[PDB]
PDB file of C-alpha atoms and ligand atoms in Angstrom:
ATOM      1  CA  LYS A   1       0.000   0.000   0.000  1.00 32.36           C
ATOM      2  CA  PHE A   2       2.516   2.624  -1.086  1.00 32.17           C
ATOM      3  CA  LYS A   3      -0.301   4.858  -2.311  1.00 35.13           C
ATOM      4  CA  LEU A   4       0.428   8.597  -2.471  1.00 35.73           C
ATOM      5  CA  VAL A   5      -2.158  11.288  -3.144  1.00 38.41           C
ATOM      6  CA  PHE A   6      -1.011  14.779  -4.090  1.00 39.34           C
ATOM      7  CA  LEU A   7      -3.111  17.614  -2.666  1.00 38.11           C
ATOM      8  CA  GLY A   8      -2.825  21.376  -2.976  1.00 39.66           C
ATOM      9  CA  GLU A   9      -4.311  24.510  -4.492  1.00 43.47           C
ATOM     10  CA  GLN A  10      -4.272  25.141  -8.220  1.00 43.51           C
ATOM     11  CA  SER A  11      -0.925  25.626  -9.952  1.00 37.77           C
ATOM     12  CA  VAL A  12       1.262  24.780  -6.937  1.00 39.20           C
ATOM     13  CA  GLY A  13       3.115  22.084  -8.869  1.00 39.72           C
ATOM     14  CA  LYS A  14       1.513  18.725  -8.058  1.00 40.94           C
ATOM     15  CA  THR A  15       1.573  17.425 -11.639  1.00 40.37           C
ATOM     16  CA  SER A  16       5.024  18.858 -12.280  1.00 41.31           C
ATOM     17  CA  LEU A  17       6.419  17.107  -9.205  1.00 39.52           C
ATOM     18  CA  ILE A  18       4.898  13.782 -10.259  1.00 40.57           C
ATOM     19  CA  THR A  19       6.097  14.214 -13.838  1.00 40.04           C
ATOM     20  CA  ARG A  20       9.633  15.137 -12.741  1.00 40.81           C
ATOM     21  CA  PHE A  21       9.806  12.011 -10.587  1.00 41.30           C
ATOM     22  CA  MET A  22       8.161   9.754 -13.141  1.00 41.58           C
ATOM     23  CA  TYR A  23       9.917  10.836 -16.330  1.00 38.43           C
ATOM     24  CA  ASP A  24      12.559  13.278 -15.075  1.00 35.48           C
ATOM     25  CA  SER A  25      11.200  15.989 -17.362  1.00 36.36           C
ATOM     26  CA  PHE A  26       9.543  19.369 -16.891  1.00 35.62           C
ATOM     27  CA  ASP A  27       7.338  21.480 -19.155  1.00 34.63           C
ATOM     28  CA  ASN A  28       7.140  25.094 -17.984  1.00 35.81           C
ATOM     29  CA  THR A  29       3.832  25.449 -19.829  1.00 37.31           C
ATOM     30  CA  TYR A  30       0.718  25.256 -17.663  1.00 36.56           C
ATOM     31  CA  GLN A  31      -1.896  22.602 -18.408  1.00 34.41           C
ATOM     32  CA  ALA A  32      -4.511  22.357 -15.653  1.00 32.79           C
ATOM     33  CA  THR A  33      -5.450  18.858 -14.484  1.00 31.43           C
ATOM     34  CA  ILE A  34      -9.188  18.364 -14.998  1.00 32.06           C
ATOM     35  CA  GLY A  35      -9.679  14.864 -13.653  1.00 34.56           C
ATOM     36  CA  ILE A  36      -7.677  12.514 -11.469  1.00 33.65           C
ATOM     37  CA  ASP A  37      -4.710  10.681 -13.051  1.00 35.21           C
ATOM     38  CA  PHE A  38      -2.659   7.878 -11.559  1.00 34.06           C
ATOM     39  CA  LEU A  39       0.706   6.530 -12.465  1.00 33.16           C
ATOM     40  CA  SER A  40       3.042   4.034 -10.846  1.00 33.21           C
ATOM     41  CA  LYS A  41       6.724   3.319 -10.760  1.00 31.43           C
ATOM     42  CA  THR A  42       9.154   1.063  -8.944  1.00 30.56           C
ATOM     43  CA  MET A  43      11.916   2.820  -7.051  1.00 30.75           C
ATOM     44  CA  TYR A  44      14.946   1.709  -5.069  1.00 29.16           C
ATOM     45  CA  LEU A  45      15.594   2.324  -1.384  1.00 34.24           C
ATOM     46  CA  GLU A  46      17.131   0.713   1.687  1.00 36.72           C
ATOM     47  CA  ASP A  47      18.345  -2.480   0.008  1.00 35.87           C
ATOM     48  CA  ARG A  48      15.004  -3.187  -1.658  1.00 34.08           C
ATOM     49  CA  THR A  49      12.528  -2.021  -4.264  1.00 36.73           C
ATOM     50  CA  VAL A  50       9.147  -0.404  -3.641  1.00 35.57           C
ATOM     51  CA  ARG A  51       6.192  -0.047  -5.965  1.00 38.35           C
ATOM     52  CA  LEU A  52       4.658   3.404  -5.690  1.00 39.96           C
ATOM     53  CA  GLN A  53       1.190   4.411  -6.821  1.00 37.21           C
ATOM     54  CA  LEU A  54       0.669   8.151  -7.343  1.00 36.96           C
ATOM     55  CA  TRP A  55      -2.594  10.104  -7.515  1.00 37.39           C
ATOM     56  CA  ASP A  56      -2.625  13.535  -9.077  1.00 35.52           C
ATOM     57  CA  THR A  57      -5.696  15.540  -8.062  1.00 35.35           C
ATOM     58  CA  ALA A  58      -7.217  18.606  -9.708  1.00 34.14           C
ATOM     59  CA  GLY A  59      -6.517  21.727  -7.675  1.00 32.93           C
ATOM     60  CA  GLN A  60      -9.140  24.028  -9.201  1.00 33.21           C
ATOM     61  CA  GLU A  61     -12.027  24.424  -6.768  1.00 36.66           C
ATOM     62  CA  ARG A  62     -14.696  22.969  -9.064  1.00 39.88           C
ATOM     63  CA  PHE A  63     -13.137  19.506  -8.682  1.00 38.01           C
ATOM     64  CA  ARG A  64     -12.880  19.429  -4.887  1.00 37.63           C
ATOM     65  CA  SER A  65     -15.898  17.129  -4.462  1.00 35.16           C
ATOM     66  CA  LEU A  66     -13.972  14.416  -6.343  1.00 35.81           C
ATOM     67  CA  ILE A  67     -11.038  14.328  -3.916  1.00 39.02           C
ATOM     68  CA  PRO A  68     -12.243  12.642  -0.684  1.00 39.17           C
ATOM     69  CA  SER A  69     -12.503   9.225  -2.368  1.00 38.74           C
ATOM     70  CA  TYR A  70      -8.768   9.378  -3.049  1.00 37.50           C
ATOM     71  CA  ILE A  71      -7.700  10.529   0.413  1.00 38.83           C
ATOM     72  CA  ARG A  72      -9.562   7.737   2.229  1.00 37.89           C
ATOM     73  CA  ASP A  73      -7.711   5.370  -0.062  1.00 37.08           C
ATOM     74  CA  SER A  74      -4.155   6.651   0.346  1.00 36.41           C
ATOM     75  CA  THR A  75      -1.516   5.800   2.952  1.00 37.08           C
ATOM     76  CA  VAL A  76       0.499   8.943   2.208  1.00 41.67           C
ATOM     77  CA  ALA A  77      -0.777  12.451   1.537  1.00 41.11           C
ATOM     78  CA  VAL A  78       1.647  14.897  -0.071  1.00 43.00           C
ATOM     79  CA  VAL A  79       0.290  18.393   0.596  1.00 44.21           C
ATOM     80  CA  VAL A  80       1.903  20.876  -1.779  1.00 42.68           C
ATOM     81  CA  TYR A  81       2.089  24.658  -1.704  1.00 45.32           C
ATOM     82  CA  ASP A  82       3.918  27.248  -3.822  1.00 47.35           C
ATOM     83  CA  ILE A  83       6.589  29.187  -1.903  1.00 48.03           C
ATOM     84  CA  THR A  84       5.686  32.282  -3.937  1.00 47.43           C
ATOM     85  CA  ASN A  85       1.986  32.068  -3.085  1.00 49.78           C
ATOM     86  CA  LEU A  86       0.779  32.964   0.419  1.00 52.01           C
ATOM     87  CA  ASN A  87      -2.747  31.650  -0.125  1.00 52.37           C
ATOM     88  CA  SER A  88      -1.476  28.252  -1.251  1.00 56.41           C
ATOM     89  CA  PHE A  89       0.464  27.987   2.009  1.00 56.22           C
ATOM     90  CA  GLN A  90      -2.475  29.092   4.167  1.00 56.37           C
ATOM     91  CA  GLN A  91      -4.672  26.508   2.444  1.00 55.73           C
ATOM     92  CA  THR A  92      -2.415  23.624   3.490  1.00 52.88           C
ATOM     93  CA  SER A  93      -4.233  23.661   6.834  1.00 54.82           C
ATOM     94  CA  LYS A  94      -7.473  22.833   5.023  1.00 53.41           C
ATOM     95  CA  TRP A  95      -5.834  19.914   3.213  1.00 52.15           C
ATOM     96  CA  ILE A  96      -4.080  18.594   6.319  1.00 53.73           C
ATOM     97  CA  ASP A  97      -7.313  18.958   8.277  1.00 52.81           C
ATOM     98  CA  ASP A  98      -9.189  17.034   5.567  1.00 53.26           C
ATOM     99  CA  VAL A  99      -6.651  14.199   5.495  1.00 53.41           C
ATOM    100  CA  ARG A 100      -6.690  13.691   9.253  1.00 53.43           C
ATOM    101  CA  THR A 101     -10.476  13.791   9.413  1.00 54.58           C
ATOM    102  CA  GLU A 102     -10.504  10.959   6.877  1.00 55.80           C
ATOM    103  CA  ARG A 103      -7.422   8.967   7.941  1.00 58.55           C
ATOM    104  CA  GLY A 104      -6.793   9.968  11.545  1.00 59.24           C
ATOM    105  CA  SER A 105      -3.379   8.878  12.849  1.00 55.37           C
ATOM    106  CA  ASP A 106      -3.097   6.187  10.156  1.00 56.00           C
ATOM    107  CA  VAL A 107      -1.541   8.397   7.487  1.00 55.18           C
ATOM    108  CA  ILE A 108       1.867   9.798   6.603  1.00 53.30           C
ATOM    109  CA  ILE A 109       1.701  13.443   5.587  1.00 54.01           C
ATOM    110  CA  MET A 110       4.453  15.360   3.816  1.00 55.41           C
ATOM    111  CA  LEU A 111       4.139  19.141   3.532  1.00 54.12           C
ATOM    112  CA  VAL A 112       5.899  20.394   0.399  1.00 52.29           C
ATOM    113  CA  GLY A 113       7.011  23.937  -0.373  1.00 55.23           C
ATOM    114  CA  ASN A 114       7.495  23.821  -4.155  1.00 57.24           C
ATOM    115  CA  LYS A 115       9.113  26.234  -6.663  1.00 55.89           C
ATOM    116  CA  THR A 116      12.285  27.046  -4.714  1.00 53.12           C
ATOM    117  CA  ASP A 117      13.907  28.188  -7.959  1.00 52.69           C
ATOM    118  CA  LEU A 118      11.694  31.303  -7.842  1.00 51.77           C
ATOM    119  CA  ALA A 119      13.826  32.779  -5.078  1.00 51.18           C
ATOM    120  CA  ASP A 120      13.056  36.418  -5.906  1.00 50.00           C
ATOM    121  CA  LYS A 121       9.316  36.076  -5.332  1.00 50.42           C
ATOM    122  CA  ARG A 122       9.391  33.786  -2.288  1.00 47.10           C
ATOM    123  CA  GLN A 123       6.693  34.724   0.235  1.00 46.66           C
ATOM    124  CA  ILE A 124       7.144  31.929   2.769  1.00 45.10           C
ATOM    125  CA  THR A 125      10.509  31.220   4.394  1.00 44.97           C
ATOM    126  CA  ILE A 126      11.730  27.653   4.596  1.00 43.54           C
ATOM    127  CA  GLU A 127      11.801  28.105   8.379  1.00 44.32           C
ATOM    128  CA  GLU A 128       8.110  29.049   8.484  1.00 45.40           C
ATOM    129  CA  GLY A 129       7.262  25.900   6.546  1.00 44.67           C
ATOM    130  CA  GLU A 130       9.479  23.736   8.736  1.00 47.34           C
ATOM    131  CA  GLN A 131       7.911  25.260  11.832  1.00 44.32           C
ATOM    132  CA  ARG A 132       4.355  24.723  10.561  1.00 45.53           C
ATOM    133  CA  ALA A 133       5.170  21.081   9.766  1.00 44.70           C
ATOM    134  CA  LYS A 134       6.585  20.543  13.248  1.00 45.06           C
ATOM    135  CA  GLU A 135       3.611  22.200  14.954  1.00 49.52           C
ATOM    136  CA  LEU A 136       1.232  20.009  12.948  1.00 46.28           C
ATOM    137  CA  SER A 137       3.368  16.871  13.300  1.00 46.08           C
ATOM    138  CA  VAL A 138       3.854  16.230   9.584  1.00 47.46           C
ATOM    139  CA  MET A 139       6.965  15.812   7.442  1.00 45.82           C
ATOM    140  CA  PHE A 140       8.422  18.757   5.512  1.00 45.86           C
ATOM    141  CA  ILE A 141      10.572  19.422   2.455  1.00 45.72           C
ATOM    142  CA  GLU A 142      11.102  22.132  -0.163  1.00 47.56           C
ATOM    143  CA  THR A 143      11.376  21.276  -3.848  1.00 45.22           C
ATOM    144  CA  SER A 144      11.608  22.570  -7.400  1.00 46.40           C
ATOM    145  CA  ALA A 145       9.988  20.434 -10.083  1.00 44.48           C
ATOM    146  CA  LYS A 146      11.621  22.808 -12.560  1.00 44.83           C
ATOM    147  CA  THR A 147      15.237  22.260 -11.530  1.00 44.49           C
ATOM    148  CA  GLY A 148      14.498  18.856 -10.011  1.00 47.39           C
ATOM    149  CA  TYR A 149      15.817  19.982  -6.628  1.00 52.93           C
ATOM    150  CA  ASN A 150      14.872  17.543  -3.833  1.00 50.91           C
ATOM    151  CA  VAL A 151      12.293  15.728  -5.967  1.00 48.80           C
ATOM    152  CA  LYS A 152      13.893  12.302  -5.550  1.00 51.46           C
ATOM    153  CA  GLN A 153      14.490  13.115  -1.869  1.00 51.56           C
ATOM    154  CA  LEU A 154      10.760  13.798  -1.425  1.00 51.34           C
ATOM    155  CA  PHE A 155       9.770  10.319  -2.600  1.00 54.11           C
ATOM    156  CA  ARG A 156      12.702   8.666  -0.824  1.00 53.40           C
ATOM    157  CA  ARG A 157      11.701  10.179   2.512  1.00 51.05           C
ATOM    158  CA  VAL A 158       8.031   9.294   2.091  1.00 51.05           C
ATOM    159  CA  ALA A 159       8.889   5.734   1.060  1.00 53.18           C
ATOM    160  CA  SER A 160      11.346   5.425   3.951  1.00 54.20           C
ATOM    161  CA  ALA A 161       8.616   6.572   6.348  1.00 53.08           C
ATOM    162  CA  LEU A 162       6.275   3.898   4.981  1.00 55.50           C
ATOM    163  CA  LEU A 163       8.888   1.170   5.464  1.00 55.70           C
ATOM    164  CA  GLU A 164       9.272   2.322   9.078  1.00 56.22           C
TER     165      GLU A 164
HETATM  166  N1  LIG B 201       9.379  27.989 -11.730  1.00 55.20           N
HETATM  167  C1  LIG B 201       8.740  26.878 -11.399  1.00 55.20           C
HETATM  168  N2  LIG B 201       7.555  26.621 -12.021  1.00 55.20           N
HETATM  169  C2  LIG B 201       6.982  25.430 -11.602  1.00 55.20           C
HETATM  170  C3  LIG B 201       7.471  24.538 -10.652  1.00 55.20           C
HETATM  171  N3  LIG B 201       6.618  23.444 -10.497  1.00 55.20           N
HETATM  172  C4  LIG B 201       5.655  23.725 -11.327  1.00 55.20           C
HETATM  173  N4  LIG B 201       5.798  24.908 -12.037  1.00 55.20           N
HETATM  174  C5  LIG B 201       4.970  25.585 -13.062  1.00 55.20           C
HETATM  175  O1  LIG B 201       3.772  26.007 -12.369  1.00 55.20           O
HETATM  176  C6  LIG B 201       2.554  25.889 -13.188  1.00 55.20           C
HETATM  177  C7  LIG B 201       1.573  25.009 -12.458  1.00 55.20           C
HETATM  178  O2  LIG B 201       2.212  23.702 -12.239  1.00 55.20           O
HETATM  179  P1  LIG B 201       1.315  22.338 -12.233  1.00 55.20           P
HETATM  180  O3  LIG B 201       2.217  21.173 -11.986  1.00 55.20           O
HETATM  181  O4  LIG B 201       0.415  22.415 -13.414  1.00 55.20           O
HETATM  182  O5  LIG B 201       0.421  22.631 -10.988  1.00 55.20           O
HETATM  183  P2  LIG B 201      -0.756  21.714 -10.384  1.00 55.20           P
HETATM  184  O6  LIG B 201      -0.769  21.743  -8.918  1.00 55.20           O
HETATM  185  O7  LIG B 201      -0.520  20.359 -10.938  1.00 55.20           O
HETATM  186  O8  LIG B 201      -2.167  22.543 -10.765  1.00 55.20           O
HETATM  187  P3  LIG B 201      -3.656  21.881 -10.975  1.00 55.20           P
HETATM  188  O9  LIG B 201      -3.411  20.912 -12.030  1.00 55.20           O
HETATM  189  O10 LIG B 201      -4.231  21.437  -9.675  1.00 55.20           O
HETATM  190  S1  LIG B 201      -4.663  23.411 -11.355  1.00 55.20           S
HETATM  191  C8  LIG B 201       3.049  25.257 -14.541  1.00 55.20           C
HETATM  192  O11 LIG B 201       3.215  26.343 -15.483  1.00 55.20           O
HETATM  193  C9  LIG B 201       4.449  24.625 -14.174  1.00 55.20           C
HETATM  194  O12 LIG B 201       5.354  24.540 -15.284  1.00 55.20           O
HETATM  195  C10 LIG B 201       8.733  24.781  -9.995  1.00 55.20           C
HETATM  196  O13 LIG B 201       9.199  24.014  -9.159  1.00 55.20           O
HETATM  197  N5  LIG B 201       9.287  25.996 -10.444  1.00 55.20           N
HETATM  198 MG1  LIG B 202      -2.043  19.295 -12.283  1.00 52.33          MG
END
């Protein structure tokens, strides 16, 4: 049950993160997700292999009613925000709240501050994200689907958490 569901407001980088991990590519052009896609891939870690299942959800508000079914079903929830967007960060509380209401203590949550490459328009410090994650008892990491920074680390840490 290495099932990961990506949650987060529109345009924070959920699809880009999944695509960077899956095919190690990045398209700077925006193409909104209008359904729910799933992919899978086998990765290596801690002297073994693990089969991951990834769910990419639509962040636009008109698709929110389609998301609960996927949360109930996943063992890991990756809540993503955009470090250049204050609202996207504030909204992570809603997503984390939703996940815990549906999964309780039986879930691994990773808070992700994406788009670190956009340093000049950063609105949330890495320390504020790390502090929020600690206060809410969830994992934390910053990434850049564009440069690929920490993308493999994100999945490695989530997979490691599952194994433990
Ligand atoms: N500069 C930069 N742009 C990024 C990064 N990750 C994603 N993007 C860009 O941000 C835009 C939105 O990314 P995308 O992956 O579509 O968001 P999403 O969360 O999947 O959005 P949705 O499908 O719920 S509406 C795209 O134009 C994409 O190329 C990043 O790490 N750095
Ligand atoms: Mg998308």
